[PDB]
Amino acid sequence: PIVIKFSHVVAEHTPKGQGALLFKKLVEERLPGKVKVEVYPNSSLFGDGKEMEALLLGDVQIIAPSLAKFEQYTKKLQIFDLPFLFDNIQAVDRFQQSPQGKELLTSMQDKGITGLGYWHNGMKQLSANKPLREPKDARGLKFRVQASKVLEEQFKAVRANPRKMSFAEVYQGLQTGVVNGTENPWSNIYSQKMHEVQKYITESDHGVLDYMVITNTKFWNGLPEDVRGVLAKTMDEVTVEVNKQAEALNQGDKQRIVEAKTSEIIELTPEQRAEWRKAMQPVWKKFEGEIGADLIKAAEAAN
């Protein structure tokens, strides 16, 4: 059979982990003996920084990186990293589905990559070993970020010291004090046990963690036309399922963190959240030139 390896860096009981397994389940039912899907979670095949290499060589067929991890291949996806750009997952969804949002799926056409769809995870929450209620609370802390210039600027804006790290290394980074805070949707906190080394989690919803499911164009366009049709339709069905259940998964993980009895959850007043917004929103100006001032304008319209 045609082998499709789906590699990713998250745990199985997460939006992306379930999505990859659902894709395997449906494809193997619909193309019996014609296509086999092998899923490699938790960086078990390829980890951060290395997966793009594998995809373009042909060592893996589908990956789904965070939208924040494409700056070296395109400058447009950085729009999803801008803090407080989207108020909720609804706005995110509306932008992704617009003509401009869909054109971004081909933003890496030149580099031999085909965008198959957007998968949601959820809004990011701040965590640290001290309560983060107001921007000043972050001063002097070391925060792990994904490999994004936008996210680095976000923390520099609150006088924190950002450190780019691969996802697989974050728990150890926090436990050893190399970093002392980070940002993550609830599901990544719980599934990587980061609540065990982060005493305070602030429900900031200050940015979005979402993915682009991608493949190698030469591989994908090289498939038998009939097989590709079924795979594309099946991926679209999986996207629906992932996206409808992501928020609920994250809420389940928030509750599992509460039940774990390791951390305290800080709720922000609308006013406190407005303070974070005022401190971080100036980062948008630094990236308008690369992203496109008009592209950013449309994203606001989605709100």
For Zn ion, the binding residues (CB under 5 A) are 93, 164, 241, 243, 252
Nearer to Zn ion, 164 or 277 (CB): 164
Q: Which of 269, 247, 137, 154 minimizes the C-alpha distance to 206?
A: 154
Cβ–Cβ < 8 Å for 189, 183: no
Nearer to Zn ion, 137 or 253 (CB): 253
Judging by DSSP bridges, how do beta strands 35-40 and 113-123 pair with one another?
unpaired
Rounded CA separation 45/40 (Å): 6
Question: Closest approach of Cβ 11 to Zn ion, in Å?
Answer: 11
Nearer to Zn ion, 240 or 293 (CB): 240
> φ, ψ for residue 143 (rounded to 5)?
-110, 130
Least distance between Zn ion and beta carbon 135 (Å): 20
Smaller CB separation from Zn ion, 96 or 202: 96
Cα–Cα distance, 153 to 33 (Å, whole number): 49
Q: Of 30 and 277, which has the nearer Cβ to Zn ion?
A: 30
Shortest spacing between CB 96 and Zn ion, in angstroms: 7
Q: Counting beta carbons within 10 angstroms of the beta carbon of residue 133, is it exposed (0 to 12), middle (13 to 18) or buried (19 or more)? A: middle
Instruction: State the minimum distance, in angstroms, from the CB of residue 137 to Zn ion.
Output: 21
- Would you say 130 and 99 are in contact if contact means Cβ atoms under 8 Å apart? no
Nearer to Zn ion among residue 146 and residue 216 (C-beta): 146
Query: Are β-strands 208-216 and 62-63 bridged in parallel, bridged antiparallel, or unpaired?
Result: antiparallel
Q: CA 143, CA 164: separation in Å to the nearest integer? A: 9
Smallest separation (angstroms) from Zn ion to the CB of 178: 12
Residue (of 153, 141, 146) closest to 178 by Cα position: 141
Nearest to 298 by CA among 121, 82, 45: 82
CB of 214 to Zn ion, least distance (A): 18
- C-beta neighbour count of 218 within 10 angstroms: 12
In the bound complex, what is the minimum distance in angstroms from residue 219's beta carbon to Zn ion?
Answer: 27
| Of 145 and 268, CB closest to Zn ion | 145
